């Protein structure tokens, strides 16, 4: 129960800082604000310009009348990407081939992998075949509930490695369900 | 969460901001940094100048002006995030407040957690001292809290008629019973 910080309204933050050292910190702060934000609002996608997609822009502070330059924002993303805090995706899968938006990873993919895997066991379904769609129905209500399927797919992949699961695709080789 | 946020190293923060609006936020950010710091390092006292220090960033080579710091404290005091005290107990600004009791947890809040322990330990009728309350049965967030400050968290219990305090020959609260 938190979302946006008090520093989120501190102007000097929106101004990029000339200084390898400083900028390095300032960016972390932003990285951090992002995760915390998406996390509490249970959001998953962020457009490169900061727009939030809903299963509303975080770099444009209306109240403070300030906005982070795209130039900086980009620095923010890469940095966040280098750190594994976000995932570059295009009109669908992992791409940073015209990456259009980001999958904010406040929880590692492997981490999500576990929590989902967990669910499966903590619900005995550890042998059945459930779809990704139902993965986000009434039965689910762990942090990952409502997570897009495309992104859900990336959280399950870890289960395919670690040989704990097998995915099932439809006629158009699209993952639709999975058995763990 | 560490003792210091990433913003703790963001210079612009140490510079006071000319602006009722802005400063107001900047201060909250500092208030916040303090609580969070003290909380995780399980610290309780902070000297007005910041000695825990926390206002003098060595790595960043930057330090908040006392002027600002004072604004920080009052603001933090208005909010009830801290408690002003002289070498003794609660003591107002001028009235020689020498240090602060950082309230990362409201007094009423602490009040509850302590009350809680009592019930969660059935001792809800006995007479335990503040010393034992701080120093081998206690291990909730309040474990190790100074007695003087512990006293202020129990007071709420005297109000709400849930407890009675017992002082020694030198009218010093030593124990308490919170039936």
Residue numbers in the entry:
A (entry chain A): 1 to 55, 73 to 113, 116 to 155, 158 to 201
B (entry chain B): 1 to 52, 74 to 156, 159 to 202
Paper quotes:
Successive assemblies of Endosomal Sorting Complexes Required for Transport (ESCRT-I, -II and III) largely mediate sorting of plasma membrane receptors at endosomal membranes, the formation of multivesicular bodies and their release into the endosomal lumen. ESCRT-I subsequently recruits ESCRT-II, composed of Vps22, Vps25, and Vps36, which in turn activates ESCRT-III subcomplexes. Two recent crystal structures of a core of the ESCRT-II complex reveal a trilobal complex, containing two copies of Vps25, one copy of Vps22 and the C-terminal region of Vps36. The human and rat homologues of ESCRT-II were originally identified as the EAP complex (ELL Associating Protein; Vps22/EAP30; Vps25/EAP20; Vps36/EAP45), associated with the RNA polymerase II elongation factor ELL in the nucleus.
Here, we report the crystal structure of full-length yeast Vps25, composed of two homologous winged-helix domains. Vps25 consists of two homologous winged helix domains as detected by the program GRATH that are arranged in tandem. The N-terminal domain 1 (residues 1 to 126) contains two additional N-terminal 3/10 helices, implicated in the interaction with either Vps22 or Vps36, followed by the canonical helix 1 and strand 1. It lacks canonical helix 2, which instead folds into a large disordered loop followed by strands 3 and 4 that connects to helix 2 (at the corresponding position of canonical helix 3). Domains 1 and 2 are tightly packed against each other and their C alpha atoms can be superimposed with an r.m.s. deviation of 3.4 Å, confirming their structural relatedness. In the unliganded Vps25 structure, this helical segment constitutes the 1192 Å2 dimerization interface of two identical Vps25 dimers present in the asymmetric crystal unit. The dimer contact is mediated by hydrophobic residues Pro5, Pro6, Val7, Phe10, Pro11, and Pro12, which is similar to the contact region described for Vps25 interactions with Vps22 and Vps36. In the Vps25 structure Arg83 does not participate in dimerization but hydrogen bonds to Thr15 instead of forming salt bridges with either Vps36 Asp548 or Vps22 Asp214 as observed in the ESCRT-II complex. Therefore Vps25 seems to dock as a rigid body onto either Vps22 or Vps36 upon ESCRT-II complex formation. Surface electrostatic potential maps of Vps25 reveal a negatively charged surface within domain 2 that is characterized by a patch of conserved residues such as Glu153, Glu170 and Tyr152.
